Amino acid sequence: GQVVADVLCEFLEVAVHLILYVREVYPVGIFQKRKKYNVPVQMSCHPELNQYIQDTLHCVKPLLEKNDVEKVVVVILDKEHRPVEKFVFEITQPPLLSHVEQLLRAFILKISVCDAVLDHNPPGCTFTVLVHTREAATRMQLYVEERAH
Amino acid sequence: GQVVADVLCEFLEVAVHLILYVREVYPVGIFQKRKKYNVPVQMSCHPELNQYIQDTLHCVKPLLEKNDVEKVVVVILDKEHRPVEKFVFEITQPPLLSLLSHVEQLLRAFILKISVCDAVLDHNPPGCTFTVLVHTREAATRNMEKIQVIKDFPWILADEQDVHMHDPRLIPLKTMTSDILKMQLYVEERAH
Amino acid sequence: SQVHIFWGAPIAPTTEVILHYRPCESDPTQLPKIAEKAIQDFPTRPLSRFIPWFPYDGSKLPLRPKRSPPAS
């Protein structure tokens, strides 16, 4: 079948992991360095967080396989349960390719530079995941929305 | 007195130690896991290297107290003494007219951003060395006596071979704004 | 049309709404009214463009320690 959806969620787990490590939600001492595609990522060694992310990507993966994927959003909520930061991931499917590994790294650099500018989050913040899809009358890249605070 | 130089020198010490670990300027066998600002860092256990880093920052400290520093750059040079990457710390100190663990909780993000440099930069050639460049606000020769605080650790003017890079790629890392401190950190990497 | 709110994450160790309640999670009171906040928009302050403060000026030479660090 179409295995491209199997690799996107594969590094989507990395992307959210990076955000959690980078948006300093809490002491990140749980993270450990592990290598995939000869690039290392700080992945949380907390089993419950990994289980939540794995169940998340396992439920979203077939939506990628059926071209039912419009946006993937990561929302940061303050202790008042109000959103402060939204990482929107818009995806447009084509309207071996393992040899192109440099773009797997360049995606990471785009998240890094997009974070390089935002302000520091309030303490005690948590997060949640959103998936937006659609199949009505239609008549990858990302951008971030930051709150005033 | 003016104490921001003490937290800056301790932050720069843990930053350079982590930079030497993440960029593999030295083998991993000389590094040990320590905790600073509630984050695991890799500190050097080499006595001469630790004394080298401490002597450097103890001399840079009085210029920070005087607020006579624009940027502090960590330059990694290849075996031909040519800069391949530069970690630029742009510094702005606004005037002043209350606890300061807020600064430590703020400086944590810069260390966390230095850790992802393993993922954004291509691996350096083997046998690289490093040096620290201080771009002063006032011309550097005016305040040369302010840094000669250690008798056996003299300071010199760098030359073009240590500083110049031909059209380097700019890699943003972190920006911080505060009532006490304004700091930016980015990387200038060679086109390779 | 479809929004898959994957509700989860712990703390300190008209379009259709497909919420993902999760198991014995039932304890932080009215979960749907909480999730109503996360789907809502907010006034976003547009991203600040990143620019360096002091570019590389060829006239102002920097300072350097005379010693080079020890090698392996």
Numbering used by the authors:
A (entry chain B): 12 to 106, 115 to 158, 199 to 208
B (entry chain A): 12 to 108, 114 to 208
C (entry chain X): 2 to 14, 33 to 91
Q: What text does the study give?
A:
TRIP13 forms a hexamer to drive the REV7-mediated disassembly of Shieldin in an adenosine triphosphate (ATP)-dependent manner, thereby releasing the DSB DNA ends for resection to promote HDR.
To test whether REV7 can adopt a dimeric alignment in its complexes with SHLD peptides, we next designed a fusion protein containing an SHLD2 fragment (residues 1 to 19) fused through a Gly–Ser linker to an SHLD3 fragment (residues 1 to 58) and a C-terminal fragment of REV3 (residues 1887 to 1894) (labeled SHLD2.3). The structure of this SHLD2.3–Rev74 complex was solved at 3.8-Å resolution (X-ray statistics in SI Appendix) and is shown in two orientations. In each REV7 conformational heterodimer, one REV7 adopts an open (O-REV7) while the other exhibits a closed (C-REV7) conformation. The SHLD2.3 fusion protein serves as a strap with its N and C termini binding O-REV7 and C-REV7, respectively, therby strengthening the conformational heterodimerization of REV7. The 936 Å2 dimeric interface between O-REV7 and C-REV7 is further mediated by multiple intermolecular hydrophobic and hydrogen bonding interactions. The C-REV7 forms the typical safety-belt including an intact β8′/β8″ hairpin, identical to that observed in the SHLD3s–REV7 complex, while O-REV7 lacks both the safety belt and the β8′ strand. The β1 strand of SHLD2 is positioned between the β6 strand of O-REV7 (antiparallel alignment) and the β1 strand of SHLD3 (parallel alignment) as shown in Fig. 2 G and H, with this sandwiched β-sheet topology stabilized by hydrophobic and hydrogen bonding interactions.
